[PDB]
Amino acid sequence: TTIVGVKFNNGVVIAADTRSTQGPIVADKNCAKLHRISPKIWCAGAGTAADTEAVTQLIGSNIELHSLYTSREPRVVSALQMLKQHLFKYQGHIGAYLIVAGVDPTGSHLFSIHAHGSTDVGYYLSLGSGSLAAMAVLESHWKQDLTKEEAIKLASDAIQAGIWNDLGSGSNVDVCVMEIGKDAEYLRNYLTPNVREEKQKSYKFPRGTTAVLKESIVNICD
Amino acid sequence: TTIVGVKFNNGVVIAADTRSTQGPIVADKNCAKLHRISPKIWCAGAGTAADTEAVTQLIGSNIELHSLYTSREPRVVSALQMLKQHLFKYQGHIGAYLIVAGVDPTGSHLFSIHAHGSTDVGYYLSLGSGSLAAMAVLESHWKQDLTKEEAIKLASDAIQAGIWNDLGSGSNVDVCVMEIGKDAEYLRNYLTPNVREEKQKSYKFPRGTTAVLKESIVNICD
Amino acid sequence: LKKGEVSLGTSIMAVTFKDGVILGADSRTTTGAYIANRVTDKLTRVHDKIWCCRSGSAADTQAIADIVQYHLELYTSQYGTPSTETAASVFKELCYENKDNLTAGIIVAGYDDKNKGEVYTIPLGGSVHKLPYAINFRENMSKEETVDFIKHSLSQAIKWDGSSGGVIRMVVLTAAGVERLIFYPDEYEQL
Amino acid sequence: LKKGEVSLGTSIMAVTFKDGVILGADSRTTTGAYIANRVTDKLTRVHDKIWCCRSGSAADTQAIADIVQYHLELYTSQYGTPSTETAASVFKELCYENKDNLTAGIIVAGYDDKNKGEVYTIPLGGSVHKLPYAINFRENMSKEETVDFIKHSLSQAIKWDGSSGGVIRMVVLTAAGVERLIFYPDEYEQL
Amino acid sequence: TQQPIVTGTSVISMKYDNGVIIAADNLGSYGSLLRFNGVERLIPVGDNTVVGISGDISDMQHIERLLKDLVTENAYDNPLADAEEALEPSYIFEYLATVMYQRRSKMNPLWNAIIVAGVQSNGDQFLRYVNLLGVTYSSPTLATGFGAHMANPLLRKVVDRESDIPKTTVQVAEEAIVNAMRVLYYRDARSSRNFSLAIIDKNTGLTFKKNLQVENMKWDFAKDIKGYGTQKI
Amino acid sequence: TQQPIVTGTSVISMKYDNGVIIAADNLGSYGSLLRFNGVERLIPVGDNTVVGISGDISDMQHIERLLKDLVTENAYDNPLADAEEALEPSYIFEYLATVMYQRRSKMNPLWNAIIVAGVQSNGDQFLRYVNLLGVTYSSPTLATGFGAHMANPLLRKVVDRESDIPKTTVQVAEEAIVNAMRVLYYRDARSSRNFSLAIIDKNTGLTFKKNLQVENMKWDFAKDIKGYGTQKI
Amino acid sequence: QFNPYGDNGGTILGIAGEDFAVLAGDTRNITDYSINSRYEPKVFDCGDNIVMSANGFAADGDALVKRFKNSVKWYHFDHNDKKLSINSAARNIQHLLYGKRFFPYYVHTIIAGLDEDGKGAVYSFDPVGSYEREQCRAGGAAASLIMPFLDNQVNFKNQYEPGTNGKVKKPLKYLSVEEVIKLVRDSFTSATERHIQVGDGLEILIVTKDGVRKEFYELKRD
Amino acid sequence: TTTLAFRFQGGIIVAVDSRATAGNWVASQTVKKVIEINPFLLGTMAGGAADCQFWETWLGSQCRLHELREKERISVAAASKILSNLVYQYKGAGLSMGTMICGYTRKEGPTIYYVDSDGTRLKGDIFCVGSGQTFAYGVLDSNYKWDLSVEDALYLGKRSILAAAHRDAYSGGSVNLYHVTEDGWIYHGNHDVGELFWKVKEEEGSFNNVIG
Amino acid sequence: SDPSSINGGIVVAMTGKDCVAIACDLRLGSQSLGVSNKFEKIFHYGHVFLGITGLATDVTTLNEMFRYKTNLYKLKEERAIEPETFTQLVSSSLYERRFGPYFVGPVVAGINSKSGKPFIAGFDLIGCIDEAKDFIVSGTASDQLFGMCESLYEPNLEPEDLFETISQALLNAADRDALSGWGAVVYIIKKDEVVKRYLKMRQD
Ligand SMILES: [Cl-]
Ligand SMILES: [Cl-]
Ligand SMILES: [Mg+2]
Ligand SMILES: [Mg+2]
Ligand SMILES: [Mg+2]
Ligand SMILES: [Mg+2]
Ligand SMILES: [Mg+2]
């Protein structure tokens, strides 16, 4: 996995790759690693896939209920705190490595959370097996006072670095842009630089190729 | 075991206890831990009893042959060097912890050797399980410019500290005094402060107590 | 210390001086030989004028510091502003009772108006030690001297320890208020 | 390091200065927490004006130093007085080829008339490093300054490390000859 | 189950004709590092008892609080808290010894070795040891850690048995203790020069001496020592 | 069987149109300690090859002597030792790669990762890697340790494949290398600011640059960072 | 890892007569090779003419004795000051010991007193509560040295009547309190010679219908 | 340790040795390895001494409570099952027990149950447990008949323990005999193995390998 | 899997007045199983007696070895070996295998044919000599023997008295050891006559 987060002028952007491994096997070639916690708070997750989804949905549920109770839009620090306290409680056994970002009435925020419950603040962050490839790019090209378009470029470039150079990362680039005063825009498959080439042959079988012993109609109705 | 060595005016003195353990069992109540390497070079040994005797006899043998070859009286540094090089070669597997002392044409010397092959120089030394009890005494009462009689007292006091306070040490005190220009005097059982008290009863059996099945004469002659 | 978890090294210090107390630290955070964060803030606020320096496990020290901040906020609501000694006690109580599961080395530093600048160190075991300073110091140094003392000291730690590096952050606690200071590599390296 | 064997600690140094070079060390030798020898001489002569500082295993460092002394005595008989660099090479050759079975950290220091004072350090791996000094120093210090530098440095090591203690021994290597110095606890502690 | 971090070394003590003496250095070590030099490991409870503690320092500070809280609790609804129903060394000991054994039986010990030294209401001397295992014993001389190996042998030359106690004065006892502390400084790698000493006398009461130093040491003979065997220079 | 003691970190390299570049910092680390700061880990062999070595420093110094002894031995009974029968990078590599595999096959490896960078007699660029296991590979960009994770991704943006080599100049290549070294200083805990860099060009020959420093770093943004989440001050 | 057990050494001995019973034990307390105390009693008067010793790990021995003493106290409260018979105490101690079957008291327990017919009784326990009444029993470190001697002298094992061709055994008979104390003293002086953990002093508690009497004897201090 | 118990025409014979060892050290030669649960029931000790003593004494208490409540002698089946169900609760904790619960009732006749600390409960005619069980089985198997007389049966049990006591290092001391009838058990004395061996050797002509 | 306690057995030696005695049990087993009741552990080479406890294969092997060495000693020296000399031979031979030792506990006993002095000695498995005036013990019941010998023994016993003392030391020690017993033999050794008696003991 390769996930990043980049702060810019009037907001924050996060990105991720779309490969899901199972050892050396690619289970999913186009999986969604960007999670919605609240409408304007999104989370990119690396590590144990079932854990990143389960923890982001649980906190997202509790955030929605909190938002209704308080009659206020949720804050990123609320998500951040609820997540780290949950992760810390399980002492790293919930293998969720997250990058949390969003906009709230306080402003635009970007954080990272490790499985053990440690949080970090930054203008640019990267997590996952391709975090070193991505951070190399970020440390080379990042600057203060980025624009929305500059930040999306930097982010997707950082993810690409992981796709190409890291075997645990691959396929496509997902992005989500959270700008202040605007609706958050989720860019699913923002880049698709790994399209499978045409096959040399069609392996469509002549009908009757397969040997059959029995046939029967299944009753799905009542 | 408790062994010590003390330097004085015109010579050196070493002492030792006489207990030989086998776990918590006392195998020998009056064993000799003072070894003769050459006539005027004596060695006190602690650790593995078979190793201290075997190593001191081997070096003593080679020292005797060397003395005959060179037409000279042996030196302590020669014994010291031959011992440490042998012990070092076996990497501590020969559990011999020694205090080497003697007089030669160069003067009076006192050294210690550890099983691993390290040597130390000193005016007062102690080795064995009772070395801490003994060194406590030596550090309390030792001074520069001791006399022969003061040194024997200090030495036997240091050994006593081990006899009483250390369970691995016991029984009697052996001493050997090596003075310059004199024959070395080996004082076997210099002190005997652990004499067994009279038994309350004689357990001498009435003759015929023991039941017997057969009797026969053994032929030891040709 | 758990395997692969984020470590905070150990280059932190707090020094008392004439006008109050100064906390100082580096900014490096590691996961093995990889620097996870090079601009970390190890100087954390538990109360208006009571701060701490964190070392060891980042997760553990954050969780504790958060709890302490909770206790001192609740203390203040009921019993008024707490003492630096009280803050150190709460830290200790947590670090001591949970010593089996934690790896946290904390230095607590604060400013009272009666007690002035105080420094308490809380090592791994969960013991507390009140000191004049913690990590040719003299008592009652000036602000400028104490800054140079912390600067020069941490500068050397960074020079020889790979677990340490980045910027040198410092927080000054006085009756005047709270002042944050920062010193970049080009400045401190060539000292 | 083999279990129970005699350890030499690690508080040793050699510093080059105007007139030559000075070796310095403590006198403590341990077996666990027990001080086996408190007046050890860790400064050993391998040649007239080539000495070494021993650290790690006492047995290992003694065996090596003895062998080196043998090689330099034989070298001198055939090829004349050897260089300090040559001495360091023989040490390294032994420490490197037998790195699996040894625990020896050695600092070699010597005085030539051409090369003047030289210092070579040989750590655990069996690598060699030529340096101006080894363990705020200035090149070409005076004898009195270099003594105070070693004295103050080892004094602190003894203060904070339990593997170090006793007296501070020093050997001065110059064209004048060889001078042995010693400094007792009452002097260096209250520095 | 624990492992000790910052530790305190030997605590030595002995009985004399009118009371007891106890001493311990002012050091808190950290493996091999001599980190904390202002550590008081002797804790007076009232004006008739002194508890000397070695081992883990954080567990020692816990025990300090227990004893302090014990004194407070004893004064509750007790008009004779400074007289007949005041705390005795034997009460304080049995409390700690109960705690130490309970903690080891829960497999969560207080990693300490404790010596309670004091004088009872009837003038009798009290000197008893308890450690992390809850093991207790009493003797004319008691010591922990290294003190057991190096100090006890020296102190037992003065008081080798019960009958030697009336013959031993405070001046002699204090001299043996101070000598023992010097020997431990020579030979214990985990010790310091600075130490504290306390005397509980049935006539003069509790005398507590801080900021003592080991002195009259022998180091001069070191200059004559050269090399490790053959070396002459 | 060994275990490395004093080590050297990343060695990074890349090909450009007329030659190769190689670089490595001047540090010898001891676990976590930055002990030796004057360590040269780039070793020129002749005027056409540079061997960059990471890993155990004592094993590196052994390899230095082998290469030095190789040059001497090649000059023996060789009138063309400074011309046709001079040492080539491909000769020097195959020698080391033979040694490294022999040592691992004897279960006594040289704990190193090596990159031989050079230019052949016919002008071709040479860049090949070998490590303690005897594993060899070649690529337009090569790096050891961290460099493999952080530098390669940056250098491959410049030369992503063989066809990009003629398009890459020395000025661009050197800039990528120097940038990569800064990134490693930011993110490798076992790295230093000081480093060495070498260029082997088929026209201008071997240029060896010592005492370089990482510069133009970004640290200013650190002042705006406060706490780890909620903290505002 | 924390080892909750230890070995405090020492050895105990219980012999039963016709109208009396003795329970003896050395007064030395040790850990490893050090001496903790030269006089630390471990044979106790528990009331109702019962004497008790729990030898092995002193902390467990002290706790067990303390609990049994308390068991005697509550037996009186609950049962109208009834006297606790030696057989009833034995069964009670079994339940105390077995109550910790899965975290035992590391002690060999012996009690002595008089049975309900006024005859001497000795009961020995294993660490978890198996018990048996006996005429003779040694326990602790030097039990292996002492016990075969008792078999020979108390129960007259292996001794046949002189002249009877080993057909007629030597007849069993009760010994006097004076003869028993001789065997105890000689048992302990012999054990002191060959066992390092045994020495310093010997305390014997004799039990008759008149009450409990004590006797102390010195032993070698090495 | 060697313990055997077998059913026959005249009831049950129970025979055990007396030795207890802690390693090579012989702690006791006078150990009671038959537990008198009550006047009608016996139990053998093998494995853990305390485990067998404690829980078979406890069993006697449960058997007494049964007959108080039900006004009828408890069956051997029911008595054995109370013990086996109890130790099964403790399975895994480390109890060590190998015992024969022996009794003679009207509805059952002479009955023996092997009960064991891993929960096993077997009814049978002949059982042998202990380090010397194999030696005892040999003598039993070759000489056992249902129509044995009480005199001959007692000797067979005695002789079988002797066979074990001789060969098995951890068996010896003395032999304890019991005969269990419908009206209760009868003790048939303690027999020192030392004296018994020589006696049997002479009278029987066995053990020719041994010089006497 | 402790070689010194697989087969089991014991040996004890005592001095008297112008006499020595040496005795052994007769058991050989394989842990709990008793295998032989005739396994004698005492051998003699001329007038020097050697008892060996421990691992039975090494007992047999060492006897064959010292028979070998003493037979050659006699051919070359033209005289039989003495106890003091033989003791050093045993120590030499054992330490020769210092890092691959024979698992034995030998005991030497005999009288010097020249001086008439009684001599006994014991060794550990690597040849540490334990010379003694009083008695020597070896085997699986060495602790037991130490307790019996230390209490029963008294100096200058006559042959007929020493017999009873050593016999009772052995028998009662062996009865508290599971791996010792099954028979016993006692050698009473005088300057120019030697009596060998088989004891009657319990066979369990
Ligand atoms: Cl942090
Ligand atoms: Cl040394
Ligand atoms: Mg990929
Ligand atoms: Mg020190
Ligand atoms: Mg003794
Ligand atoms: Mg048997
Ligand atoms: Mg037997």
Side-chain angles (χ1 to χ4, degrees), chain A residues 84 88 91 114 116-120 124 132 139, chain C residues 2 5-6 34 37-38 58-60 62-63 66:
Chain A
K84 66 139 61 176
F88 183 84
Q91 303 279 286
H114 293 258
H116 296 279
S118 34
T119 56
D120 285 312
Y124 57 101
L132 275 69
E139 293 276 47
Chain C
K2 293 162 229 217
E5 90 166 302
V6 173
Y34 177 60
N37 191 348
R38 56 171 178 109
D60 294 344
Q62 283 182 15
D66 286 349

Side-chain angles (χ1 to χ4, degrees), chain B residues 173-192:
Chain B
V173 182
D174 285 349
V175 182
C176 185
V177 194
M178 288 151 285
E179 193 165 18
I180 297 173
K182 300 206 167 193
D183 288 354
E185 50 170 344
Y186 176 51
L187 307 170
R188 171 75 164 161
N189 290 7
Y190 179 70
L191 289 168
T192 54

Side-chain angles (χ1 to χ4, degrees), chain C residues 60-74:
Chain C
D60 294 344
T61 56
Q62 283 182 15
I64 285 165
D66 286 349
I67 290 170
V68 169
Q69 190 174 17
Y70 160 77
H71 274 285
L72 300 187
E73 184 162 294
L74 193 55

Side-chain angles (χ1 to χ4, degrees), chain D residues 79-109:
Chain D
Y79 321 121
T81 307
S83 58
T84 312
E85 182 176 41
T86 294
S89 188
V90 180
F91 267 115
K92 173 217 87 202
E93 209 67 26
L94 294 166
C95 292
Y96 176 73
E97 295 291 340
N98 296 291
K99 58 154 76 196
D100 290 349
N101 309 303
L102 295 170
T103 306
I106 290 169
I107 301 176
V108 182

Side-chain angles (χ1 to χ4, degrees), chain A residues 19 162-171:
Chain A
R19 178 180 283 177
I163 286 167
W164 305 128
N165 306 122
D166 179 41
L167 298 184
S169 310
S171 291

Side-chain angles (χ1 to χ4, degrees), chain B residues 19, chain G residues 28 191-193 195-199 220 222:
Chain B
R19 178 180 283 178
Chain G
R28 177 180 268 175
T192 299
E193 289 287 301
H195 205 104
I196 65 172
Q197 301 179 339
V198 179
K220 282 171 71 168
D222 62 340

